[PDB]
From Swiss-Prot:
<dbReference type="GO" id="GO:0004222">
    <property type="term" value="F:metalloendopeptidase activity"/>
</dbReference>
<protein>
    <recommendedName>
        <fullName>Zinc metalloproteinase</fullName>
        <ecNumber>3.4.24.-</ecNumber>
    </recommendedName>
</protein>
<dbReference type="GO" id="GO:0006508">
    <property type="term" value="P:proteolysis"/>
</dbReference>
<dbReference type="GO" id="GO:0046872">
    <property type="term" value="F:metal ion binding"/>
</dbReference>
<keyword id="KW-0645">Protease</keyword>
<keyword id="KW-0862">Zinc</keyword>
<comment type="function">
    <text>Cleaves collagen, gelatin, casein, alpha-1-antitrypsin, and bovine insulin. May play a role in the pathogenesis of legionnaires disease.</text>
</comment>
<dbReference type="GO" id="GO:0005576">
    <property type="term" value="C:extracellular region"/>
</dbReference>
<feature type="active site" description="Proton donor">
    <location>
        <position position="251"/>
    </location>
</feature>
<keyword id="KW-0865">Zymogen</keyword>
<feature type="binding site">
    <location>
        <position position="189"/>
    </location>
    <ligand>
        <name>Zn(2+)</name>
    </ligand>
</feature>
<comment type="similarity">
    <text>Belongs to the peptidase M4 family.</text>
</comment>
<feature type="binding site">
    <location>
        <position position="165"/>
    </location>
    <ligand>
        <name>Zn(2+)</name>
    </ligand>
</feature>
<feature type="binding site">
    <location>
        <position position="169"/>
    </location>
    <ligand>
        <name>Zn(2+)</name>
    </ligand>
</feature>
<keyword id="KW-0479">Metal-binding</keyword>
<keyword id="KW-0732">Signal</keyword>
<keyword id="KW-0378">Hydrolase</keyword>
Length: 328
């Protein structure tokens, strides 16, 4: 008899600051079993799992007491809103929220499910938090989302940007299938960086145009993993398609389409939601697993035709990243 209930708690980190769910940001969607006054960091669309610094688990939801409808309860094991670690207030609060934003931006804004099953039923977003010991990564493994708590260089890696990034690697294999190498691998990596921006936009109405600044320790020298307005700021990512060479790792050939996306959403009468709508649809209906950068421009133009967007805004942008769409 687990029923809807409203979770109140804190999030953030020492760098971007600490904020309260139910004041600064929406209440969390939890479930509650009254007869035991136990609560669960789980709703229809998102399960948050507390790995407790282990490396394997059974993905039973994080479970916290909620003893004593506009009633709300405080999250965390000591029912005070906290699950503090390595400078973060409660990375598990931040996953539940991240899982929400991503599930909603995809379903409400684009009408599609971020995650679906083989047979087409939607697939519940499992967020595995506190994974490992001082783990400085977050990754997608086909079935679920794993976030490390970081170490000396980064705070725990639960944030809308990181979460949207890694989750949307699920969106790409169940749709376009953009292979994780070559040009398509850059496009894959790129799509996740766009989804990272779209999650920050759903949330607060503006976005970083960077990747990971919120998780980088403020005394770690680095301030951001990638810049999408000018990728080559990072020293190695490329800005235009003509700079490609087959030996780019995907996190550095991602600069092309990341630049493209920044250029498109900054066009007159464009916003982020419009530009990502094109990409979600191109990923959904036209992009091929072996896609070249030029084939991706065709997929975008074909998608915009399906949604009615302005094709000449698309082309100027493609043209600025030295992609040519002549043969589509
Ligand atoms: Zn990635």
């Amino acid at each position: 008899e687990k029923v809807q209930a409203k979770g109140m708690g804190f999030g953030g980190n020492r760098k971007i600051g600490e904020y309260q769910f139910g004041k600064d940001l929406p209440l969390l969607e939890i479930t509650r079993d009254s007869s035991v006054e136990m609560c669960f960091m789980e709703n229809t669309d998102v399960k948050v799992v507390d790995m407790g610094h282990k490396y394997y688990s059974n993905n039973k939801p994080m479970q916290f007491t909620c003893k004593e409808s506009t009633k709300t309860y405080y999250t965390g094991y000591s029912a005070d809103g906290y699950d503090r670690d390595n400078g973060a207030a409660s990375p598990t609060n931040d996953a539940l929220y991240a899982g929400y934003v991503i599930k909603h931006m995809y379903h409400d804004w684009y009408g599609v499910e971020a995650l679906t099953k083989s047979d087409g039923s939607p697939m519940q977003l499992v967020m595995r938090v506190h994974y490992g010991q001082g783990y400085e990564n977050a990754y997608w493994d086909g079935k679920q989302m794993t976030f490390g708590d970081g170490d000396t260089m980064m705070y725990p890696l639960v944030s809308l940007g990181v979460g949207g990034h890694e989750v949307s690697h699920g969106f790409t294999e169940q749709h376009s299938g953009l292979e994780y190498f070559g040009q398509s691998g850059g496009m894959n990596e790129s799509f996740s960086d766009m989804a990272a921006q779209a999650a920050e936009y759903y949330s607060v109405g503006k976005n970083s145009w960077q990747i990971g600044p919120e998780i980088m320790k403020e005394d770690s020298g680095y301030d951001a993993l990638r810049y999408m307005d000018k990728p080559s700021r990072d020293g190695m990512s490329i800005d235009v398609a003509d700079d490609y060479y087959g030996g780019l790792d995907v996190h550095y050939s991602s600069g092309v389409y990341n630049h493209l996306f920044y250029i498109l959403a900054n066009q007159p009468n464009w916003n982020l939601r419009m530009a990502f709508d094109v990409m979600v649809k191109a990923n959904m209906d036209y992009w091929t697993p072996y896609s070249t950068f030029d084939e991706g421009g065709c997929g975008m133009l074909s998608a915009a035709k399906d949604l009615g967007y302005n094709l000449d805004d698309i082309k100027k942008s493609l043209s600025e990243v030295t992609i040519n769409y002549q043969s589509c």
